[PDB]
Design a binder for these strands. Structure first.
Ligand SMILES: Nc1nc2c(ncn2[C@@H]2O[C@H](COP(=O)(O)CP(=O)(O)OP(=O)(O)O)[C@@H](O)[C@H]2O)c(=O)[nH]1
Ligand SMILES: [Mg+2]
Ligand SMILES: [Mg+2]
Ligand SMILES: [Zn+2]
Lengths: 83, 708, 63, 21, 226, 585, 237
RNA sequence: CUUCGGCAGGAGAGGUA
């Protein structure tokens, strides 16, 4: 696009994230649920294997689950069924 | 806070009390200015909160009748010649005559120069009458202002709200360590310090015998000796420092009424609440945006704006049913690296540096050798030097209270410097918060290399209508530099009305501009153009009051001249060290289980109704739920949230608040049958629930602290 | 009656509700704020709250 | 004036005061 | 055309603490940047010496008074911030002052140690009576800039030590002026006239060599690209 | 971004810091880490910088009059005990730096963090939710800088001289870099008319159509422009595909540019452009040269003649009264008008004398701050003052604040300062009680559907015919017809349909309707919605803050109430610089 | 003394004639004392060469058209003022331009006398369309900086020589920005980001190595006074 | 695995935005 590189919270751009959902209220729950799944996987690693998988995208040095979830959404690696 | 605030607390008239008005009953006609207030109550000095118009100050010349009515003096003019007999008149008698003005053209013999004069009639109307029926005359201008308002130079050039704010802000200035006197002022700072009472005044004439920093001895003319003691580093009601310093030598001769020792905000007998700083009026890179101020680093290196602040701490030993308490250094089983500053009796030693969480007085109370530990520790955020200790003991014949055996008071002093967030002000309604402190080498400097001290923005001057500050800046530059008007051929037309001894001045002179009779703009414009040069033969400020500046970061000169001068700046008692607060978890209330309120105890910030409206309009339903239940009242979810954060797991679901249950209990207690139903009736019990609430962490969530 | 009692004139509203034996359905913003539920607006409505998210088949296979 | 040891502060005033504060 | 005349420095002494330096011919536009580089290096990064702490006899803190002295310990601390000292060592060095009896305590009573000189010989510390004694011990160090006071608990010291602030800069005022010969034929040049003033601790010429060295050491991180 | 002190950050982030400390083997158990954090050990400060990274915080200032009183930022650690706040967010908060304080809150769970980062971020909320006008835009100093930069002064240094004979053009330049190199040497000014050959800047519509016509691929296409260097410098701060402006940047021009950018470009572009504009304006404000002195406040040249003429015209009315013919109230009503005339003659003398480059005139004329009433009060004559009731005192004040008021003139002027400070403290209750009632009456209105499939609607005006033969646009059409869904096809002269049912009325649609000749159209309103509970997203229409259709689940009643109650409480507190002339809030 | 933290240089090639250097960590304040000095000593110090005067056959009184070409005289001067020439002589050289017949006159057809080199040989100058001629004579001096047009010295000795402006510097645009870094717990250090754009005749990195030598030879005059007077030292690499 | 033992309401006055 016609913008410089984003930094910090503003990455990834929200106008590109909003073309994959129907509203601004669906993205919040999307990202929150994915983040909870990632955290469950991280905390249940050495014990019994759970169905939850993640992260799909390679993680950074110390990245919070929400940033990983947003990067997964931006790369079109998840699917959601709004109820 | 300072001598002026104490002197203004008295001479103050209150419209409230047992027999007066109220703060919501009072309407809009009693909080207004009446034409009969002239010379009795000042129309400017008043609070600006919900007390506006209900509190006032007595005027300078007014006194009180035996019956209780206020009087003001007038000068009698009979048959067109103004006499010197003074008559005190009340409003009832005043509204029957015609009273002239103080600035009438007297012809040096009592006769009015102009037949028609300006007078005040009965209904507060002003009309022109011939000089045949005028019978009274004002004794002076400034008769209608109070003592705090009469210390603002160029008052007639300021609007009413800015003058009100400046007069009220002059009483919040803190006492500085040096307190130099203003370069340009009014004539009221001398008599406002003697009458305040914070300076030492000689009572009889005599010859001084010996002088020290603790006392002065004066030998009278009849052989009697009188010695005066000085207060050194005494704490005030508001926490400031009160000091007195002798200003006389060992052979000087004094007279009755001469000032002998100084005070908190006094310099050589005159009231001094601030410092003179070199001012540049210009925008600078956005650091003085919206009333912010840029400061120099020299004002920190040389302790220009520094203040001492003292704090007092007390403890008591009371009789307990299970045995009395005592003060000793026998704290049950505690490391010996924390009991190194305590003396034999168990009190800190003088000269020791204390931080936050340090023992001041060691005390132990019999619990349920029953020895608990309750000691005086330094409150959070505080630090200083112990400067004094006072001990009162029952046994040693002391009129102590009932059930007390010992009281100790410890005093801690600190030296606070100027920093970001502190509040500064002038006398004309200027106010702002320090935005940046700049190094000396990157501030604008004059042609000879003199950096400025403070930069002020030009966008806040014209829309607020306080232009007396620029006039004070011009006159301050003229007074600091010195002047001499060239009168080789006669006297210039603009200096015709100037007195003598005002045609020639030396550097660092002190001048006085009265409140309504002072320096007109013509004389200022004339004086700005005859100014002595600096050490070299150069004139830095031209006839318009503007100077050429260099830029301290790049080096290129600024393309246009800038207004430079000297201004009087005061430090206000609104400091950022006493305003910062934060909390994660602490004490809770007893009826409702919400966090406490205040900064003295760890207290939370109220999330009121309007913030709930904002968060509902945003659409954020999880943030609001978490704010209102987990962080405030969910007694069971608080510890679970703490443990989940600490162990790194997910935040659990909220439960129920306690205020709802308290409301239900009260509604039941009002003989009302309230019940919570389900999808098929079957009222829910709402009764706690057998919980395995065993502490598998053991680390007081916050309600307390931590000891080993 | 909860919203009306928390607005104004608590005593009169409570008296009338007690005499008339009123019942509250708890379907408003103020009641859901008071008792501790999600307000029925924004991200707290049924369409957005009950949403399921899982990775696509290709992403699961690749990683 | 009227104070035995007051510092010298020159004034710009043009009128005279018949009364003392 | 390419000129082939490089600049040259020349000092024109005017006093003992003041001097003037003329750097010419400079290129059109390079008169204010060299003046401001030298003014920003001179007024910040020149090493010196200063007093870092004192210890009076019967005094434990600064908020007290001495018997016989007409000043408190805070006015003595504010009158001992105008002492010009020079050192030639890299270690704390202790000096002493011992005065008694009716007199005025000046800065020429401090007996300087071995390798410490006191320049200001007629200052004013305090004034005593006929029942007053003053014993002081000062510590002189070396450094750069302005370092605030160092608390006693950061050095494991006693109770009588009063830590004072230390301003190590030996320079007072610096200014510059740049004329310009902008004529036709486009044969222009500049001329910088710098003016340095010091504080008797150093000379106006031994400070410009320190600044030149700092700037010939910092501007050499580019030359290494060849 | 915001600036957070270290002590506040350490106190707020205690559990996370303790968790990371125990994880990194810096402590043995939780209690040891708690003690270590409580005593502020040196090893604490290493982990704070990585536990506060990308964790938003909420900032709030009281009173919270509308929705943008709370915003979310990304914290950074600073030295000191004060919070640093961006200059551009001081309009929503209504904050100034003279003693204000703000509160800080920390989201904990994942849903709260997602809401704070997506819904409440400060970079996503630029437009006002009541009218759509921008809120994060340059003001005060930045407006002065941008107004100074983009100004053309005749006869400046290095202007283009269209001469002949010996020197061909004398002022034409080959690129912006050459112009900058010329300006550095002192041969050119940034406010002189020149001709530059621009390569990477879009031409205006007419010039583009005239030269290229088909398509102006600007990356490498060259054209000649006659402008100043300041205008090129300003246009280099806008997006790449934005045509050249070539105007003088008044406040309204900047507002129009920002509105167009917001309506045609993504939000990240606008958020990145406003920072560049702020930086440039701040840089040039200091070199504009605006300062206040006593030789800058010029006085009206002939003011004694004017006030002597009106005084001799008032002596007639005086004598007339005295003798006897005029009733008292009619003498007061004559005098009031004589003095309301003399204040207008001094007002018009002052606008004539003052030059057009005086800092005082420049600050007001550029749209930065202030009015001309204050300028006339400062340098001309204040005028008539009101009494404690509300009437006019027949005695005016003839002196300005530059010469200085007299003692009676100053006494009779303190009546207007009490009424204006006793309003802020007393009549704000009348606005906050109305706001509370408005909020409580309308709280069950929520968008619940997408389309109720109704045919009812209301009819709007949309201009009127004139007897001459032209069409006059309705005075207030931006608050009655813009951003509304059309309800019935707008057929023209029994023929082609200009707009079909369902279109949102924007600017091109309004222009097309006006050109075709349609006067009255019917739209879809909230008062004729057919849905049972709440409202639907088509009848409501467009969202003012977003720019698209309102979303399902929006609380519109609260927004309405806040938008009706904020203006009256704010205007109630600003009732001293209102300008008189009539009544007030 | 010792700086305690030695500063380092970097480079981040953006294109082939535009780079971005970074110097960090610079002690508090020393980010504003090096940026404007590098900028000015980069935009007014490197020696280069440029065209100073032109002579078009046929244009003597009216300076607004050239019989044969489709452009003006302003656009020819503007197209010849953008030539990247490099000389190795020391006296004004004279070259020529000669083309005939309908054809686009590029910069390759300029026959440079032994000494000068044309670096951009595909640059447009004009397009003839009416069987015309373009005899152009040029003078290529050498120097440093930007020099405005030198008003005719031997005025009446020139019948049709049009003076032009001369861009001698091999660098076209330089900007600088000082940010803030962090070492230990002192949030007070600096960061100097430079941005140098040059002509296709030198590299962006040979300028930050040709401007750093002329400053070490200008601040070395102050050192010669007392070469034993102490300062701040950094060390080796 | 740590035995007992250790807290926080009202009223009035003055200020800041
Ligand atoms: N709800 C209340 N807010 C107050 C009150 N007093 C002050 N304030 C707040 O302080 C603010 C006053 O700010 P200002 O008077 O400076 C308004 P503004 O800056 O736009 O005008 P200028 O002073 O000319 O710059 C006001 O808007 C409130 O936000 C009060 O009594 N009640
Ligand atoms: Mg404001
Ligand atoms: Mg404010
Ligand atoms: Zn509908």
């Amino acid at each position: 696009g016609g913008y410089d590189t984003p930094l910090g919270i503003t990455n990834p751009p929200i106008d590109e994230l909003l073309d994959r959902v129907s509203s601004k209220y669906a993205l919040v729950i999307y990202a929150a649920k994915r983040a909870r799944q990632i955290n469950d996987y991280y905390n249940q690693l050495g014990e019994g294997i759970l169905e939850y998988v993640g992260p799909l995208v390679e993680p950074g040095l110390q990245e919070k689950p929400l940033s990983i979830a947003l990067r997964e959404i931006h790369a079109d690696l998840l699917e959601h069924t709004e109820g | 806070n300072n001598p002026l605030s104490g002197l203004t607390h008295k001479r103050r008239l209150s419209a409230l009390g047992p027999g007066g008005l109220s703060r919501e009953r009072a309407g809009l006609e009693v909080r207004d200015v009446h034409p009969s207030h002239y010379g009795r109550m000042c129309p400017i000095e008043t609070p600006e909160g919900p007390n506006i118009g209900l509190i006032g100050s007595l005027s300078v010349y007014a006194r009180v009748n035996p019956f209780g009515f206020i009087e003001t003096p007038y000068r009698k003019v009979v048959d067109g010649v103004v006499s010197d007999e003074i008559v005190y008149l009340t409003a009832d008698e005043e509204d029957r005559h015609v009273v002239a003005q103080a600035n009438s053209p007297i012809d040096a013999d009592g006769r009015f120069v102009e037949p028609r004069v300006l007078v005040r009639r009965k209904a507060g109307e002003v009309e022109y009458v011939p000089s045949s029926e005028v019978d009274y005359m004002d004794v002076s201008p400034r008769q209608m202002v109070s003592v705090a308002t009469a210390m603002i130079p160029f008052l007639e050039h300021d609007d009413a709200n800015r003058a009100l704010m400046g007069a009220n802000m002059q009483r919040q200035a803190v006492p500085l360590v040096r307190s130099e006197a203003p370069l340009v002022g009014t004539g009221m700072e001398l008599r406002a310090a003697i009458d305040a009472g914070d300076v030492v005044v000689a009572e009889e004439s005599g010859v001084i015998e010996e002088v020290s920093a603790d006392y002065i001895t004066v030998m009278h003319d009849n052989g009697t000796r009188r010695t005066y003691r000085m207060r050194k580093f005494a704490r005030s009601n508001h926490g400031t420092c009160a000091n007195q310093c002798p200003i006389v030598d060992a052979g000087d001769r004094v007279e009755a009424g001469q000032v002998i020792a100084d005070g908190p905000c006094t310099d050589d007998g005159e009231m001094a609440l601030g410092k003179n700083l070199l001012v540049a009026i210009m925008p600078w890179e956005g650091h003085n945006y919206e009333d912010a101020i840029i400061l120099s680093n020299r004002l920190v290196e040389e302790d220009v704006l520094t203040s001492i602040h003292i704090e007092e701490h007390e403890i008591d030993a009371r009789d307990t049913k299970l045995g009395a308490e005592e003060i000793t250094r026998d704290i049950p089983n505690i490391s010996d690296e924390v009991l190194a500053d305590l003396d034999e009796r168990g009190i800190v030693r003088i000269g020791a540096e204390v931080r936050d969480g340090d023992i001041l007085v060691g005390k132990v109370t019999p619990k349920g050798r029953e020895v608990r530990d309750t000691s005086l520790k330094v409150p959070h955020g505080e630090s200083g030097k112990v400067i004094g200790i006072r001990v009162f003991s029952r046994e040693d014949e002391d009129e102590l209270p009932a059930g007390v055996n010992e009281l100790v008071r410890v005093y801690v002093a600190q030296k606070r410097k100027i920093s970001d967030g502190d509040k500064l002000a002038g006398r004309h309604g200027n106010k702002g918060v320090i935005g940046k402190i700049l190094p000396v080498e990157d501030m604008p400097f004059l042609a000879d290399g003199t950096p400025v001290d403070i930069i002020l923005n030009t966008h806040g001057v014209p829309r607020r209508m306080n232009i007396g500050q620029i006039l004070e800046t011009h006159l301050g530059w003229c007074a600091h530099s010195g002047w001499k008007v060239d009168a080789a051929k006669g006297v210039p037309d603009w200096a015709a009305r100037l007195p003598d001894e005002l045609l020639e001045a030396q550097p660092n002179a002190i001048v006085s501009t009265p409140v309504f009779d002072g320096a007109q703009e013509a004389e200022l414009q004339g004086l700005l153009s005859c100014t002595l040069p600096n050490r070299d033969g150069d004139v830095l400020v031209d006839a318009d009051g503007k100077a050429m500046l260099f830029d301290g970061r790049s080096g290129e000169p600024f393309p246009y001249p800038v207004t430079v001068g000297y201004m009087y700046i005061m430090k206000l008692h609104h400091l950022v060290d006493d305003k910062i607060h934060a909390r994660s978890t602490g004490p809770y209330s007893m009826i409702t289980q919400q966090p406490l309120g205040g900064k003295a105890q760890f207290g939370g910030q109220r999330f009121g109704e309007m913030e709930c409206w904002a968060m509902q309009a945003y659409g954020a339903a999880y943030t609001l739920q978490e704010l209102l239940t987990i962080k405030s009242d969910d007694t069971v979810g608080r510890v679970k949230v703490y443990e989940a954060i600490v162990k790194g797991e997910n935040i659990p679901e909220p439960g129920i608040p306690e205020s709802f249950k308290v409301l239900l209990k009260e509604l039941q207690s009002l003989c009302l049958n309230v019940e919570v139903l389900s999808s098929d009736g079957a009222a829910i019990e709402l009764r706690e629930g057998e919980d395995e609430d065993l502490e598998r962490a053991a680390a007081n969530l916050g309600i307390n602290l931590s000891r080993n | 009656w909860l919203s009306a009692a928390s607005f104004q004139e608590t005593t009169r509203v409570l008296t009338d509700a007690a005499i008339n034996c009123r019942s509250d359905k708890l379907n408003g913003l103020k009641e859901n704020v008071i008792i501790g539920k999600l307000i029925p607006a924004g991200t707290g409505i049924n369409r957005y709250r009950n949403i399921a998210v899982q990775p696509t088949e290709e992403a699961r296979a690749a990683a | 004036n009227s104070v035995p040891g007051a510092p010298n502060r020159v004034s710009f005033a043009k009128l005279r005061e018949p009364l003392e504060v | 055309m390419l000129i082939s005349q490089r600049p040259t420095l020349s000092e024109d002494v005017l006093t003992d603490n003041r001097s003037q330096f003329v750097i010419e011919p400079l290129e059109p536009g390079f008169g204010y940047t060299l003046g401001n580089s030298l003014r920003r290096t001179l007024l910040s990064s020149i090493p010196g010496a200063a007093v870092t702490s004192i210890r009076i006899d019967g005094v434990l803190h600064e908020f007290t008074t001495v018997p016989g002295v007409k000043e408190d310990v805070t006015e003595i601390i504010l009158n001992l911030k105008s002492l010009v000292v020079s050192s030639e060592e890299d270690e704390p060095v202790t000096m002493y002052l011992r005065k008694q009896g009716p007199g005025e305590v000046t800065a020429g009573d401090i007996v300087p140690p071995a390798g410490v000189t006191v320049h200001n010989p007629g200052m004013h510390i305090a004034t005593l009576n006929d029942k007053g004694k003053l014993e002081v011990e000062l510590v002189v160090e070396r450094g750069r800039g302005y370092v605030p006071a160092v608390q006693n608990r950061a050095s494991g010291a006693e109770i009588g030590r009063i830590p004072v602030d230390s301003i190590y800069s030996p320079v007072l005022k610096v200014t510059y002026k740049v004329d310009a010969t902008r004529v036709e034929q486009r044969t222009d040049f500049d001329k910088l006239i710098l003016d340095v003033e010091t504080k008797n601790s150093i000379s106006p010429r031994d400070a410009l060599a320190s600044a030149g060295k700092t700037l010939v050491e910092l501007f050499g991180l580019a030359r290494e690209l060849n | 971004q915001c600036g957070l002190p270290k002590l506040m950050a350490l106190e707020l982030f205690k559990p996370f810091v303790m968790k990371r400390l125990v994880d990194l083997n810096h402590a043995q158990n939780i209690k040891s880490a708690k003690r270590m954090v409580e005593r502020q050990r040196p090893q604490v400060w290493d982990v704070l910088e990585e536990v506060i990274a990308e964790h938003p915080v909420l900032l709030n200032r009281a009173p919270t009059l509308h929705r943008l009183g709370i915003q979310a930022f990304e914290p950074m650690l600073v030295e000191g005990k004060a919070i640093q706040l961006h200059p551009l967010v001081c309009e929503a908060f209504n904050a100034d730096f003279d003693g204000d304080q703000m509160a800080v809150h920390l989201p904990l769970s994942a849903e709260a963090q997602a809401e704070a980062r997506i819904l409440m971020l400060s970079s996503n909320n630029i437009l006002s939710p009541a009218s759509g006008r921008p809120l994060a835009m340059p003001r005060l100093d930045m407006v002065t800088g941008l107004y100074y930069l983009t100004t053309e002064v005749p006869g400046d240094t290095g202007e283009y001289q269209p001469a002949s004979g010996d020197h061909p053009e004398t002022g034409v330049y080959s690129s912006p870099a050459e112009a900058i190199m010329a300006a550095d040497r002192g041969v050119l000014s940034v406010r002189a008319k020149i001709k530059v050959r621009l390569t990477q800047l879009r031409p205006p519509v007419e010039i583009e159509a005239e030269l290229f016509g088909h398509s102006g691929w600007q990356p490498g296409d060259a054209w000649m422009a006659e402008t100043t260097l300041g205008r090129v410098m300003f246009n280099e701060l806008l997006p790449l595909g934005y045509p050249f402006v070539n105007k003088q940047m008044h406040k309204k021009v900047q507002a129009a540019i920002i509105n167009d950018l917001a309506e045609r470009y993504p939000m990240i572009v606008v958020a990145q452009t406003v920072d560049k504009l702020k930086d440039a304006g701040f840089y040039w404000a200091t070199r504009s040269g605006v300062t206040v002195s006593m030789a800058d406040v010029l006085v009206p040249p002939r003011k004694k003649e004017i006030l002597d003429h009106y005084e001799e015209r008032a002596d007639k009315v005086e004598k007339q009264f005295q003798r006897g013919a005029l009733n008292h109230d009619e003498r007061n009503e004559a005098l009031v008008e004589i003095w309301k005339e003399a204040t207008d003659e001094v007002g018009q003398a002052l606008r004539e004398h003052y030059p057009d480059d005086n800092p005082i005139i420049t600050i007001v004329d550029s749209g930065a701050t202030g009015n001309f009433t204050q300028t006339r009060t400062l340098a001309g004559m204040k005028g008539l003052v009101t009494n404690p009731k509300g009437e006019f005192i027949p005695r005016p004040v003839k002196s300005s604040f530059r010469e200085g008021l007299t003692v009676l003139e100053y006494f009779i002027n303190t009546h207007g300062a009490r009424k204006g400070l006793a309003d802020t403290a007393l009549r704000t209750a009348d606005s906050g009680y109305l706001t509370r009632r408005l909020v409580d009456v309308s709280q069950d209105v929520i968008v619940r559907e997408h389309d109720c499939q109704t045919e009812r609607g209301i009819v709007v005006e949309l201009a009127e015919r004139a007897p001459d033969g032209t069409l006059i646009r309705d005075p207030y059409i931006e608050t009655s017809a813009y951003a509304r869904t059309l309800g019935t096809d707008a057929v023209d002269e029994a023929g082609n349909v200009i707009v079909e049912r369902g279109q949102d009325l924007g600017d091109p649609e309004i222009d097309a309707l006006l050109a075709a000749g349609i006067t009255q159209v019917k739209v879809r309103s909230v008062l004729t919605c057919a849905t049972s509970t709440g409202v639907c997203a088509t009848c409501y229409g467009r969202s003012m803050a977003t720019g698209k259709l309102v979303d399902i689940g929006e609380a519109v009643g609260i927004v309405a109430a806040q938008s009706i109650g904020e203006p009256g409480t704010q205007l109630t507190m600003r009732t001293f610089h209102q300008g008189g002339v009539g009544e007030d809030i």
